[PDB]
Symmetry: C3
Subunit: 93 residues, 3 copies
Amino acid sequence: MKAASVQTAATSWGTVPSIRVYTANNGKITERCWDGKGWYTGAFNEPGDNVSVTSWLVGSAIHIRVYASTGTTTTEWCWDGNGWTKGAYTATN
Amino acid sequence: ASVQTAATSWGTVPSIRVYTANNGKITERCWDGKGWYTGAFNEPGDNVSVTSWLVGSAIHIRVYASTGTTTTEWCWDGNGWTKGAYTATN
Amino acid sequence: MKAASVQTAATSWGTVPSIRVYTANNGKITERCWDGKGWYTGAFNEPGDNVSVTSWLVGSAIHIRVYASTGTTTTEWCWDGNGWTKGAYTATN
Ligand SMILES: O=S(=O)(O)c1cc2c(O)c(c1)Cc1cc(S(=O)(=O)O)cc(c1O)Cc1cc(S(=O)(=O)O)cc(c1O)Cc1cc(S(=O)(=O)O)cc(c1O)C2
Ligand SMILES: O=S(=O)(O)c1cc2c(O)c(c1)Cc1cc(S(=O)(=O)O)cc(c1O)Cc1cc(S(=O)(=O)O)cc(c1O)Cc1cc(S(=O)(=O)O)cc(c1O)C2
Ligand SMILES: OC[C@@]1(O)OC[C@@H](O)[C@@H](O)[C@@H]1O
Ligand SMILES: OC[C@@]1(O)OC[C@@H](O)[C@@H](O)[C@@H]1O
Ligand SMILES: OC[C@@]1(O)OC[C@@H](O)[C@@H](O)[C@@H]1O
Ligand SMILES: OC[C@@]1(O)OC[C@@H](O)[C@@H](O)[C@@H]1O
Ligand SMILES: OC[C@@]1(O)OC[C@@H](O)[C@@H](O)[C@@H]1O
Ligand SMILES: OC[C@@]1(O)OC[C@@H](O)[C@@H](O)[C@@H]1O
């Protein structure tokens, strides 16, 4: 397809800080990461036309949730330290 | 091309709120650590963003619902959703 | 064509609180601000069809990152206490 304009979502944590920026582009969401020393590409790569994100700390451990939507189906993807796993989020859109 | 979403979270449980704009209406799904359920937020909007903050242990949520060039702010402050003072000149 | 629905992004900090709302409208992003005493127009004004935002505190100092996208080009804008400056962010494409 052709990407008219991409759509991003962003989250951050700590004081360095760490930042994650998710970009929905041509039905694919990819991730860019900053941990204080340059931007690099993250492991998140899942389908989606629209993305939102939230994150929180448990102690010094980061937890990230990415809500990826295509059509009326939103899939939650979870980062809890050991790879991206599909979460329990469901909606009836 | 799809529904549009916005998400916020608070605490360490955590609580999460996910807002979805679909065909002109924004609805809300909630996580408080024990399963997803539908929340009380239901207002018009084609586009949505959200932010939230804690005062002590109390949560305050602001949802920015946009239709055309008009953005309406909706406020949760512990007892129902009320319209906020936000305006813009778009 | 009639102007399509605007797209917004929001961040907040502290307990007053301070809130910043960014609106992408007809290719331009503007900013509205709240710090407890009425909404007002902020200094941020840059091109973009899409906007996302994140912010974090270092002590009392707020740091804001706005991701403004036009086409497939995302520009990061940085607030670190004294004016907006362009950040190092580049995307995968
Ligand atoms: O159905 S698709 O999404 O695959 C599609 C592919 C192409 C298309 O040309 C179009 C759709 C139609 C079309 C849409 C738009 S938009 O909806 O406003 O984005 C714009 C154009 C257009 O032909 C005009 C146009 C603009 C530009 S740009 O100003 O540089 O972004 C480039 C092109 C355009 O045709 C060339 C072009 C690039 C691309 S690329 O995949 O982005 O390289 C695909 C297609 C192209 O015609 C080939
Ligand atoms: O096609 S739409 O469903 O978006 C539509 C909604 C409304 C409409 O009145 C029209 C279309 C017709 C219309 C078309 C055009 S044109 O296509 O650009 O020539 C222009 C107008 C118009 O009413 C005039 C107009 C423009 C604008 S602005 O471009 O955003 O400044 C706003 C309005 C206009 O009447 C007010 C308005 C707002 C809204 S909103 O969605 O609540 O913001 C809906 C409708 C409105 O008429 C109600
Ligand atoms: O250190 C990089 C990384 O592991 O950080 C956590 C998540 O953002 C992952 O997708 C990403 O690859
Ligand atoms: O650990 C994963 C999980 O339980 O985290 C909290 C929520 O995001 C849930 O939807 C998700 O499945
Ligand atoms: O526990 C559910 C609830 O009361 O939480 C706070 C707000 O998100 C409300 O819309 C929602 O119904
Ligand atoms: O208590 C509601 C309110 O004052 O909260 C702070 C801002 O969100 C204002 O727009 C809003 O009217
Ligand atoms: O007090 C307003 C202001 O300085 O707050 C920080 C940034 O949001 C600036 O763009 C904005 O003008
Ligand atoms: O001080 C600016 C900067 O270094 O802050 C951290 C990241 O946002 C970088 O992209 C950015 O250039």
